[PDB]
């Protein structure tokens, strides 16, 4: 603050700024995907697709 006092005044009260945090968290979750493919499906599709 910057207030106006008299010329013979008495030095008004103090003030400062303030700095604040944000804290923005990540370790909770994760996006994922699965397949479940066989071992014989991979074999007969190496000769039956163009």
């Amino acid at each position: 603050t910057a207030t106006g006092v008299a010329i013979t005044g008495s030095a008004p009260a103090a003030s400062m700024d303030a700095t604040l945090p944000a804290q923005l968290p990540i370790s909770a979750a994760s996006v994922q995907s699965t397949f479940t493919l066989n071992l014989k499906e991979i074999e007969e599709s190496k000769e039956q697709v163009t």
Binding site: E43, E44, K46, E47, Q48
Partner: protein
């Protein structure tokens, strides 16, 4: 109170006699083939003329 009576050790001999019958006779002469496909399809010809 014999000197070596409880300090005997029982040792088997090399006489394994496998007595089960695991015989694969008809499988042993079929001329094995591989098949990396879904199913075998072949053609059978009939009459008609």
């Amino acid at each position: 109170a014999k000197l070596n009576l409880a300090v005997l050790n029982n040792v088997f001999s090399e006489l394994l006699t496998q007595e089960i019958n695991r015989s694969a006779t008809f499988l042993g002469l079929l001329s094995k083939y591989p098949e990396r496909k879904s199913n075998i399809q072949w053609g059978v010809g009939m009459g008609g003329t």
